[PDB]
């Protein structure tokens, strides 16, 4: 996370680290949506251009973490993957459209003061909050600069940007399954997700019921925190139907 700050303890209890076993390393960010379901970006698992195509056994899910590199005894819980589900229409060929994936953990994780699920938005919640100017929150252990790594989970609040502005900031084709966030060159403030943050959550706290909802998944970006560029996010609600069906088809 570029230009963010250290997360408070227990500030993002749904934060999940997608960890590579061999070598042992941070692969991506992710989020806890129930005791057995972890949500992330499809690109974190399958992405041919970067020769990425992980299988369950290649991965480990680290939940309840704060420190980046340290094994947090008695706090974090490390789970194994039973199955990975990637959106059937995820398009890595043209533009990372429908960049979303679900991972079912082998056995339920126990909630604690550091482990707790985030809500998925309903139609009304999404309509009311997914508006230009409204701020969301992005967290992760990714790079602090485009070109180091944080010691602790970083957090940054960023404003949703008008779709026209998002489109005009890049030559890439934006789809309705994506949204962008971040400050404009003249807004003074800054911050953005970066390498190591993808797959992570973009959440918003509903002022109607005081609950945190995950509106986006760190998807793609050009550089990190570049003036005139914005971070793009998978529109979670737009793909909720897929989420619903997978969870009640193969889930618990």
């Amino acid at each position: 996370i570029v230009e963010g700050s250290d997360a408070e303890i227990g500030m993002s209890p749904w934060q999940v680290m997608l960890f590579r076993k061999s070598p042992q390393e941070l692969l991506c960010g992710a989020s806890l949506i129930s005791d057995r379901w972890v949500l992330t970006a499809a690109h974190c698992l399958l992405y041919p251009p970067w020769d990425k195509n992980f299988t369950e056994n290649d991965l480990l899910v680290r939940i309840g973490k704060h420190s980046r590199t340290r094994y947090e005894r008695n706090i974090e819980k490390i789970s194994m993957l039973e199955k990975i589900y990637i959106h059937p229409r995820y398009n890595w060929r043209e533009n990372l459209d429908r960049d979303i994936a679900l991972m079912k953990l082998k056995k339920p994780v126990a909630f604690s003061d550091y482990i707790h699920p985030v809500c998925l938005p309903d139609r009304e919640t999404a309509a009311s909050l997914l508006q230009a100017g409204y701020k969301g929150r992005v967290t992760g252990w990714g790079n602090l600069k485009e070109t180091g790594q944080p010691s602790v989970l970083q957090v940054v609040n960023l404003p949703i940007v008008e779709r026209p502005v998002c489109k005009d900031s890049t030559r890439i084709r934006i789809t309705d399954n994506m949204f962008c966030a971040g400050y404009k060159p003249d807004e003074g403030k800054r911050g953005d997700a970066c390498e190591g943050d993808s797959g992570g959550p973009f959440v918003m706290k509903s002022p109607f019921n005081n609950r945190w909802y995950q509106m986006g998944i760190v998807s793609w970006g050009e550089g990190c925190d570049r003036d005139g560029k914005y971070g793009f996010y998978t529109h979670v609600f737009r793909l909720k139907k897929w989420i619903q069906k997978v969870i009640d088809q193969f889930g618990e």
Partner: peptide, 10 residues
């Protein structure tokens, strides 16, 4: 630079 995790998970 990741601290060793319990071998029980690998």
């Amino acid at each position: 630079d990741f601290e060793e995790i319990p071998e029980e998970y690998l």
